[PDB]
Nucleic acid binder design. Structure first.
Lengths: 40, 159, 120, 242, 117, 45, 58, 48, 94, 108
RNA sequence: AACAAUUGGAGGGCAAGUCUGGUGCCAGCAGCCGCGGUAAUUCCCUCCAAUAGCGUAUAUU
């Protein structure tokens, strides 16, 4: 009288990483000089 | 406090003891002996009870080998500490006389009936061994280390 | 060359007795070569030599390294008395005796080289 | 560990004339060889040329109390290239060779020893080096070599005597400058064998202090020795060079 | 050149000497737990005055305390590369790489293929 | 002096100095409680 | 409350407690632990630090 | 860290005990009429 | 309550069994009829599990404290002769 | 109290994984992974909020002397397909003169 | 997994559980209680003290 989804299992969690900070083209184009995003 | 905890932990670690009760016991007997030496020092020299009584006390502590036989003065018997008594106890004489590999092995080899002291065999590791009786600490006769039968594991090994 | 000559009125006797007790506590390096190893390695707490050496040059070398390591040395006048003081059945010509952290033997070494310091 | 032929670079130490040789798995305190190509007592040493010439004798804290103090974390050692050092208790001239390597060609080490045999090895080493003088006399009689020693900057003291502060006392009252360096190795088992070593060290410091020195620091040499102290003090002033 | 340190010259800083200086600030990783060192975290590890020497000879040790012809190598880094535990370096390195590829981008790319399949 | 050598027993009574050298470890404080003396942190008698 | 096999014997518990507090005093202060051993001074193992002054001003 | 310390236990103090005396203590023992060497002697049981 | 050290009592009302917090002092305190004094004092049952053992009308021994309601002063030690901690552990029945 | 707590009253409670159908879809975020993507999104939107307040509250007639030694972000018309919103940086490459390239090609 | 050492205290971690507060995603107190499952499950502790002894209450010195 059992269910297989009901049993406790081991949970494997890789370390969560997220994508970097994605500023839009027009915002980064229209923001002033001391803060202008400098990407090579 | 903490000075007593590190002090008595140093005593229960230097010499292989089971609790702090034996430490307090040894400091109690040293308190009585050192007390008697103090109240003998209260009188002058040529007070004949300081001469004969203090002479008898330093002869008894030379005889049980706590006070070293070189120094013969009641100030030098005031200057004692509990590592002298624990250094004179039987367990530490088993280890310092090298019958045992460690001090806890020495207390095992005393509650275990493997050692004798002279004619007696001694179960108590708190036995205040006399300086004259220091040399005759050895293994007991029916033990596997003093001849005799080779004991349980080798009996079940031969069978 | 035996200018730290120990005196037969019981200073020799306390030296040889402490030799025997260190022999029973296994704190004892016997013979000139093993004495030399203990002094050069710096384990040595005190060192006795024997002035009854038939050429004494063969033990004259260790007062140098004992002066370098600053350990007290003293001569007893009989290598046979030193030899059965050790318990060897041969003649021990020069003996060195070390110490540990906690022993009444270490106390006896301390008082003994206090007397050797009263000589030198 | 420090095998013969391992590559090991040399950088200066914090002191004047003392060097430290860092290798892959170890480091080695070392001085500069005054007479190149010659080891004194059979020690490892380091050769390097300018970018034949440069040579660095490796210095042992087990055979030298002063190396035990420099690896023991001493503030100053008072000795520099150009100093005058009065070494007391100079057995065989080994640490006298390292002090002579510190004060260098323009310095002067005044080695004093009582024994004639260490006198002879001292005359061998002190015949090889020309800044060390050999003096074989009693350190308890400074008026024997008062014709030999001028006013020195530093006194190093390594004697195994019970009257060590008195010996260094009269030697400083004849030969040590106004505001002089003093660096004493102390063996508590040699002064008082039945007393605790901190109390022996503090009592010897007090005997220097009523002998009118000024103790700057004390350190105990105890990963390398047992019950040994190194006391660094300064004669008649609070600050060293005056 | 220092005038009171007996003319140790200034560091003729070459890329091999700079590798050796890096190895000397990194000797704790070299002896992989078997020997730990004085933690020396200064920012600029290159000193002002250095001089690359070799140990010559102890007059009591010549049997075991002496490098051989196939071991008197040219740099400290070549000595460390000559020694053992190089596969131990690579083993610990792939523990670290297997932990730094944990959930980064091949993981999420596998998730996208798993959903789209 | 006690901070330098740390051998001594300090015989004091004031809360200022007794509280000052309860901060540095392993020193005994001897006081006088009106009929006899007292020892704070010497683990002997 | 679930207790330990080391807590079962008080003598074993003070033995394992002294071994740890002998271990921690190695980390803090400097213990002698013998002079030069067999090999005879392979250098100052565990580094040399030049700025550090570990001494009591007096 | 000073010699002869085992985790806030000075093993370096052993009889004959040294004792720095303060002005507070000399005032309060001449006030408590309690002689100094004999009562330090009596509270430590050891030569000071 | 300074003449005797332990006082017997009747559990009168389990005060605040309808509370929400499982180990708050409201749920822990119990109204007690003191036998010899006749007063009604409330006392801290030290657990909600022990509160499941403290029943109505039962003879209950109480003691003091020593140091959510600072001011309730006594403490339930026994229920019907058996100690309440020995009831909390599985030592004894009642 | 902590002394008045049993050992079954300290049992860790077990987190439940996904059904085997959803095992394709991934990790069941429970509270930790939710807090990681929530704090990461809050940080991103906080930085974008500060940058929108920059671009809104910027001064059009501003002058810096780095504008005489930098090339600006341009527009979609001056940059075209190679338009990101950013300012390019220097790789350290340079147009190298003809004498020194003669030196480098005698070496080559 | 035994020939089966205790008595006190301090602290950490935990659910598709519960309860409460409130200008989302926070915080609180707390949790033997969770979807299934009881021949079902095999999962989480560290430190301090005394230690065949120890805790607690009042009188207290």
């Amino acid at each position: 009288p059992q269910n297989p989804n009901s049993t406790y299992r081991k949970i494997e969690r890789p370390e969560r990483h997220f994508n970097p900070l994605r500023v839009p083209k027009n915002l980064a184009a229209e923001l002033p000089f001391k803060s202008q995003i400098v990407q090579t | 406090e903490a000075a007593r905890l590190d002090s008595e932990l140093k005593l229960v670690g230097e010499y292989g003891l089971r609790n702090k009760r034996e430490v307090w016991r040894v400091l109690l007997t040293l308190s009585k002996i050192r007390r008697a030496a103090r109240i003998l020092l209260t009188l002058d020299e040529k007070d004949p009870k300081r001469l004969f009584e203090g002479n008898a006390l330093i002869r008894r502590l030379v005889r049980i080998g706590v006070l070293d036989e070189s120094r013969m003065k009641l100030d030098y018997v005031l200057a004692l500490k509990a590592e002298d008594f624990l250094e004179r106890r039987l367990q530490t004489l088993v280890y310092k006389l090298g019958l045992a590999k460690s001090i806890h092995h020495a207390r095992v080899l005393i509650r275990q009936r493997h050692i004798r002291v002279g004619k007696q065999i001694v179960n108590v590791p708190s036995f205040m061994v006399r300086l004259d009786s220091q040399k005759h600490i050895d293994f007991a006769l029916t033990s596997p280390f003093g001849g005799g039968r080779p004991g349980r594991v080798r009996r079940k090994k031969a069978k | 060359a035996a200018w730290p000559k120990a005196e037969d009125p019981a200073l020799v006797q306390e030296l040889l007795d402490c030799v025997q007790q260190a022999s029973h506590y296994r704190q004892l390096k016997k013979g000139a070569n093993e004495t030399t190893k203990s002094v050069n390695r710096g384990t040595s707490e005190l060192v006795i030599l024997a002035a009854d050496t038939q050429p004494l040059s063969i033990v004259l070398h260790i007062p140098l390294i004992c002066e370098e390591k600053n350990v007290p040395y003293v001569y007893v006048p009989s290598k046979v008395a030193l030899g059965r003081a050790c318990g060897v059945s041969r003649a021990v010509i020069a003996v060195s005796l070390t110490s540990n952290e906690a022993s009444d033997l270490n106390s006896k070494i301390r008082a003994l080289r206090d007397k050797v310091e009263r000589l030198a | 560990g420090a095998k013969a032929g391992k590559k090991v670079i040399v950088e200066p130490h914090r002191h004047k004339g003392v060097f430290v040789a860092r290798g892959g798995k170890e480091d080695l305190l070392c001085t500069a060889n005054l007479v190149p190509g010659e080891s004194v007592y059979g020690e490892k040493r380091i050769s390097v040329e300018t970018p034949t010439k440069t040579e660095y004798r490796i210095w042992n804290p087990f055979r030298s109390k002063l190396a035990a103090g420099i690896l023991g974390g001493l503030e100053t050692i008072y000795m520099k290239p150009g100093s005058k050092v009065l070494y007391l208790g100079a057995a065989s001239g080994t640490s006298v060779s390292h002090v002579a390597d510190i004060v260098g060609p323009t310095g002067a080490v005044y080695a004093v020893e009582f024994s004639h045999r260490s006198g002879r090895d001292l005359i061998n080493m002190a015949t090889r080096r020309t800044n060390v003088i050999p003096i074989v006399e009693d350190a308890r009689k400074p008026m024997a070599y008062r014709m030999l020693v001028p006013m020195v900057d530093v006194i190093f003291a390594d004697v195994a005597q019970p009257d060590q502060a008195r010996i260094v006392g009269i030697n400083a009252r004849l030969f040590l400058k106004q505001g002089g360096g003093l660096l004493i190795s102390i063996k508590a088992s040699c002064i008082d064998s039945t007393a605790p070593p901190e109390q022996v060290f503090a009592s010897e410091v007090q005997k220097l202090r009523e002998d009118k020195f000024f103790p700057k620091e004390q350190l105990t040499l105890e990963p390398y020795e047992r019950d040994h102290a190194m006391v660094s003090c300064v004669y008649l002033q609070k600050e060293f060079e005056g | 050149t220092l005038s009171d340190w007996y003319n140790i010259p200034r560091t003729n800083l070459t890329p091999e000497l700079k590798r050796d200086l890096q190895l000397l600030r990194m000797r704790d990783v070299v002896a992989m737990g078997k020997q730990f060192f004085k933690k020396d975290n200064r920012k600029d590890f290159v000193p002002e005055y250095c001089q690359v020497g070799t140990i010559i000879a102890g007059a009591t040790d010549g049997v075991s305390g002496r490098l051989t012809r196939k071991e008197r190598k040219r740099t400290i880094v070549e000595e460390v590369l000559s020694s053992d535990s190089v596969s131990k370096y690579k083993r610990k390195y792939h523990e670290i790489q297997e932990h730094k590829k944990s959930g980064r981008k091949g993981y999420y790319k596998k998730l996208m293929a798993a959903r789209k399949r | 002096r006690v901070q330098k050598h740390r051998i001594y027993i300090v015989a004091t009574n004031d809360r200022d100095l007794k509280r000052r050298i309860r901060k540095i470890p392993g020193v005994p404080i001897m006081s006088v409680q009106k009929g006899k003396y007292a020892i704070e942190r010497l683990p002997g008698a | 409350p679930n207790r330990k096999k080391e807590q079962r014997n008080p003598r074993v518990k003070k033995r394992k407690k002294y071994e740890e507090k002998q271990k921690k005093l190695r980390s803090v202060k400097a213990v002698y632990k013998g002079g030069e051993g067999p090999g005879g001074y392979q250098g100052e193992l565990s580094g040399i630090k030049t700025n550090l002054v570990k001494s009591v001003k007096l | 860290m000073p010699s002869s310390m085992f985790f806030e236990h000075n093993e370096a103090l052993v009889p004959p005990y040294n004792v720095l005396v303060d002005t507070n203590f000399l005032s309060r023992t001449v006030g408590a009429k309690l002689p100094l060497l004999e009562s330090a002697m009596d509270c430590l049981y050891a030569s000071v | 309550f300074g003449g005797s050290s332990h006082a017997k009592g009747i559990v009168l009302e389990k005060v605040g069994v309808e509370a929400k917090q499982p180990n708050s002092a409201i749920r822990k305190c119990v109204r007690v009829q003191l036998i010899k004094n006749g007063k009604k004092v409330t006392a801290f049952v030290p657990n909600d599990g022990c509160l499941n053992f403290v029943d109505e009308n039962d003879e209950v021994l109480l003691a003091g404290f020593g140091r959510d309601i600072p001011g309730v002063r006594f403490k339930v030690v026994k229920v019907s002769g058996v100690g309440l901690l020995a009831l909390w552990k599985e030592k004894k029945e009642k | 109290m902590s002394s008045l707590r049993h050992a079954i009253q300290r049992r860790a409670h077990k987190e439940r994984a996904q059904p085997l159908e959803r095992q394709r879809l991934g990790i069941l975020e429970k509270k930790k992974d939710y807090r990681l993507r929530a704090r990461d999104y809050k940080k991103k939107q906080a930085v974008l909020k500060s940058l929108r307040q920059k671009a809104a509250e910027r001064n059009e007639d501003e002058f810096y002397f780095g504008m005489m030694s930098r090339k600006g972000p341009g527009s979609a018309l001056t940059r075209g397909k190679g338009f990101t919103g950013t300012v390019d940086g220097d790789r350290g490459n340079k147009a190298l003169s003809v004498e020194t390239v003669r030196l480098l090609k005698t070496q080559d």
